[PDB]
Write a protein that binds this ligand. Structure first.
Ligand SMILES: *[C@@H]1O[C@H](CO)[C@@H](O)[C@H](O)[C@H]1NC(C)=O
Lengths: 45, 49
């Protein structure tokens, strides 16, 4: 059993700007004071 | 191939640095040869030498 919502006031989808977000560690290795380059799936700035 | 090449960024940075040094050196050579004097003299209109 499950109920479907009926009261909705919907607008067109909104957008914003993601800046310098979405960076994650690409490995389980400890590096200190190093400028490391990588390529992977990332959110563009 | 570029993803595989990413681990040779040190080598490629070295190469680009060397070539940039060469280019700056060429500009320096031309300047030190020709720009000995920074007063652009112009010949007199009359030719009585
Ligand atoms: C929600 O209501 C019923 C189930 O209660 C379902 O069959 C129906 O597909 C849903 N309505 C819409 C617009 O999707």
């Amino acid at each position: 059993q499950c109920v479907n919502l009926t009261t909705r006031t919907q607008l067109p989808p909104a957008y914003t700007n993601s800046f310098t977000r979405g960076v994650y560690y690409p490995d389980k290795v400890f590096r200190s004071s190093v400028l490391h380059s990588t390529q992977d799936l990332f959110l563009p700035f | 191939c570029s993803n595989l090449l990413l681990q040779y960024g040190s080598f490629c940075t070295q190469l680009n640095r060397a070539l940039t040094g060469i280019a700056v050196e060429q500009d320096k050579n031309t300047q030190e040869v020709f720009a000995q004097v920074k007063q652009i003299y112009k010949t007199p209109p009359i030719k009585d030498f």
